[PDB]
Symmetry: C2
Subunit: 95 residues, 2 copies
């Protein structure tokens, strides 16, 4: 899987954090995957209609006309992932 492709390349390249690739969703959207401290992280890229025009985003308050524009922006500003920027809730009981 793409998760593995990154694994290889990054581990076998000393690739710095931030090395990514964008893949098309499975049923819905695209998924962003990047190298970060030995692990491959990911975040869903969502889309919507903003006043009749198609947009993409990682977080609701900042949309883009395309995946290109979305990536380039997060190439100049640190990532934001609305998928995982949520509030903690219930604890898991026992180990």
């Amino acid at each position: 899987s793409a998760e593995k492709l990154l694994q290889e390349y990054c581990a076998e390249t000393g690739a710095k954090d931030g090395t990514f690739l964008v893949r098309e969703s499975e049923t819905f959207d695209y998924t962003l995957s990047f190298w970060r401290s030995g692990r491959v992280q990911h975040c869903r890229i969502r889309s919507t209609m903003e006043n009749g025009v198609m947009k993409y985003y990682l977080t609701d308050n900042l949309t883009f006309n395309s995946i290109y524009a979305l990536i380039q922006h997060y190439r100049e500003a640190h990532l934001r992932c609305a998928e995982f920027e949520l509030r903690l809730t219930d604890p898991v009981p026992n180990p």
Copy 2:
């Protein structure tokens, strides 16, 4: 084995027994997958990668994220944090805070760099 900064706090979510990232995800799946558990369901465990550090593992509809909780001494006082923007004197306080404010993990505090060829 729980850190001294948590001695007087009730922490159902703290599991020093879960000694693996894989183990954490299974526990979360078993407990969350078909029980209707809310997103944000979590647990705290010792880091399997970084010494002295811990890891926050939570559930988000079929997904499990892991956020490193760094712990450093600052002027003779232990500080715990996800991002060095805000620190806490206990994991307890870090948890309660993120129960009222959206998470902001360090694994996302960076810019994308190069696309794999």
